[model samples]
Target: GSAAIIPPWLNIPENSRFFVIKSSSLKHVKRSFYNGIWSSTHFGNKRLSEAYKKLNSGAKVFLFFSINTSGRFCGVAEMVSDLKMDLDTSIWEDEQKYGKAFKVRWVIVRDINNRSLKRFLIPSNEMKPITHSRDTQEIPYSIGISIINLFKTQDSDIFSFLDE
Candidate 1:
C-alpha cells in the first residue's frame, strides 16, 4: 500500500500474473501448497485453462479468491509447475464439474491474514486493467510489487504497515 519492495520472485517481476479462485477451492489449494503440490482443474471453465496456459513455469502468480471477483484476496504462489492435465479427479474440490480438466500446482507462499486483508481494495487508478477476461485477469508488475509494499515483512502483524 505504500512504497514497493521486491517480491519473492524478484528476478521476473513482469513474470507475475494475477488469477482468481473460488473460496471453496482455496482449502484444497492450500493443502496442495503445503504439500508442495497444487493442481487446479478446468471444472467447466475454458478461460481458466487459457489463463494457466498463459503462465509459463517459474512465473509469479497472484490469487484473489472468494465468493465473488472482489473476493477475500488469497495469497500468492509461484508456478513451479505449469498447467497440466490430471487424470484423477478425486483430488479436486468439485469433481463432478468437469470430466476432463487441466490442473496446475502453485506453492502457497503466503495467504492473507483475513482480518485486515481487505484494507486495500486496490483502486482502479492503481490497476492497469483486466488482462485476460472477466474472472481471469493479469497485471504485469503492478500487483506483484504492490503486495510486498502493502504489507509488512512476513513476521510483522497485520496493522504494522499503517503504523511504521
Candidate 2:
C-alpha cells in the first residue's frame, strides 16, 4: 500500500488542533480510506463506537465521503492526532497489507468562507506504500471547518474560488 501524502502547502503547523470527521451510511462497518472496507479487522465495536462519539463531538473535522463512479455512497472519518494508530493489527488490515486502492483529492479552505485556496490530488496506485504505522495510510482529508464541508454552491465567494 502506498503512503498517503499531503502537500507541503496544505500541511498544518505542528500543534494546530484539527478534527477529522468520518461518515458512512453502513450500519455497522468501520472502514478507512486507505483500507477501503473493514469487516475483518482488530477494531472492535467498542473501538468504533468511541470513534463515532469523537466525531459527534463538536470540532473542526475533516470528512472523507466516497461516491463510487457508479454513484454508490461510502466513506469514513476520524480525529487527527500525533499518536498514530496501528493499521496492521488495529482495524484496517488492508491498508497495512495491500495499501490504498484509490486516490485522495483535497481542497484547502481559508476561514469559514468555504473557498478552496488550493487543491491536491494524490494517486496511491502510482506511489509506494508507507512503512510507518498502517493507520498512516489513512490520511485525513483536511478542511478548515467544524463540520465536514460537503456540497456548497459555487455562486458564493468561497465556492467561486473553485470555478477557475
Candidate 3:
C-alpha cells in the first residue's frame, strides 16, 4: 500500500482533551467571555460534580446552550489555569454564589446558529450526557474535530466575536 492514504488535515494531539458545557444561556456565555474564565455551578454529588477531574489547563472547551428544548454549539475556549474554587457570584445567574472554575480565554464565540452542529459533535439524544447533563462533559477530540476545523476555516460566524 502507498503509505496509508491520509489526507492533510487538522489533527489534535493525542493528549489533547475537549469538553462541551451546558452553559445556562448565552447570558453566561458573554459573562465568561468577558470575564476571561468559565465558571461551573456546583452540581452536587454526582458525575457532574466530578466532571472537573477530567480537566486541566491547556484543554479546549466548547460552549453549548439549550434553546427551544434543543442544544446549540456556541464557541470554544482554552483552559489556562487549574480548577479553583471561587466566591464570585456576580456574573452568574441565580447568583451562583459559588462555583468551581477555570481560567479560560475565549477563542471562538457566536450565536445559536450552530446548535445543529450538535449532530456532528454528539448524538442528538445524547446531548445532555455530553453537555448540560454534567457540569463539564468530556468529549472525544475526534468528535470535536469539526469545531477544530471550523476554527481553522474561520468562516463560521459564531466564533467571530472572540477576535475582538
Where model 3 places Cα greater than 4 Å from the true spot, the runs are 1-12, 43-70, 115-118, 121-135, 156-164
Across 1-164, the per-residue lDDT of candidate 2 in tens digits comes to 21222223333332223222222322222234434333222342234334434553444223333322222222223334312233333443333433212222333321222123123222342332111112222333333231233322222323211122
Best-matching candidate per TM-score: 3
Clashing pairs in 1: 1-150, 38-105
Distance from true position, residue 97, model 2, in Å? Answer: 4.1
Against the true structure, candidate 2 has what lDDT? Answer: 0.29
TM-score of each: 0.53, 0.23, 0.61
Clashes of each: 2, 6, 4
lDDT of 2 at 125: 21
Clash count, candidate 1: 2
Candidate with more favorable, higher lDDT: 2 or 3: 3
| lDDT (C-alpha, whole model) for all candidates | 0.45, 0.29, 0.51
**Number of the top lDDT candidate:** 3
Model 1, 19-83: lDDT tens digits are: 54553444554554445444444542455545556766665555543333334444444444444
Cα misplacement distance, residue 106 of candidate 3 (Å): 0.4
Off by over 4 Å in 2: 1-29, 32-61, 67-71, 75-78, 83-90, 93-164
